[PDB]
Design a protein around this ligand. Sequence first.
Ligand SMILES: [Cu+]
Ligand SMILES: [Cu+]
Ligand SMILES: [Zn+2]
Ligand SMILES: [Zn+2]
Lengths: 153, 152
Amino acid sequence: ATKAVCVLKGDGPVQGIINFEQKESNGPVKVWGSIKGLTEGLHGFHVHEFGDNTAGCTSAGPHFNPLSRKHGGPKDEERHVGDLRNVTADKDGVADVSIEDSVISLSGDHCIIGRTLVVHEKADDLGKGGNEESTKTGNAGSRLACGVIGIAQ
Amino acid sequence: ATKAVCVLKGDGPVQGIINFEQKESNGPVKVWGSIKGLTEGLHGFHVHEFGDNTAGCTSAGPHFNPLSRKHGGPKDEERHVGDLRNVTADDGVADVSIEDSVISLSGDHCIIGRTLVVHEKADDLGKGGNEESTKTGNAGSRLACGVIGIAQ
Ligand SMILES: [Cu+]
Ligand SMILES: [Cu+]
Ligand SMILES: [Zn+2]
Ligand SMILES: [Zn+2]
């Protein structure tokens, strides 16, 4: 298998760790881990194009989109390769994450290794938002923390 | 003209930015940038196997060595792909500027998604005669490290 990990850090209280795991060549990527310091509710969660943090998460670029598609998230509807929908923070401010994805990958042409993982302020409306914005970012608002996705043991 | 960048963040007063640039695939890689907060003198400078920073820099693993070789200097034939000799600091500042055709931002020796580590001590280039020397050049602990990501 191939493994990756990402330490999410930000300007404020938000911080966490996310693990990625791809058991088979271009198979699904198990994504689990936890993020703390978030306000109760939903937070956009995506992979952006650059693993550049010279300017915090801002320099991370737009959502990872190798196949010029619209933003989204839902099953078989159009989307960006980096759109991981939303993570949920309980009342403690901690969001336990456990999702599985078949579009992202840890090897090949949709490789997310060396790219940034971002957790946002608001919820991602998956592109159901009516306004140019919803098809770009899902109106997920600002970025609270991020990290470069790297190869793990 | 593929590019990569790295922000040597993480605990400590040691912060900096290192850019990686490689025009044509598998060709040389130009490495340059600045680091500050360092102790004066020579500091080992290497690419380690993992971009895992969960427990600070201890989780990056050993040097990025895909050919199973002993630690060495970049001009030695006997080196880890990740060995990039030493960087000098004066006030704790070190201006970096190097080339290396063994590492790469594409293919077999891609350092993307891995960790760039600058050590507390000088790297002895693997000529000590002890195990450490053939593993990390005796460069000491890891003052700072950052995962190498894809830059604009
Ligand atoms: Cu995002
Ligand atoms: Cu090292
Ligand atoms: Zn998107
Ligand atoms: Zn080495």
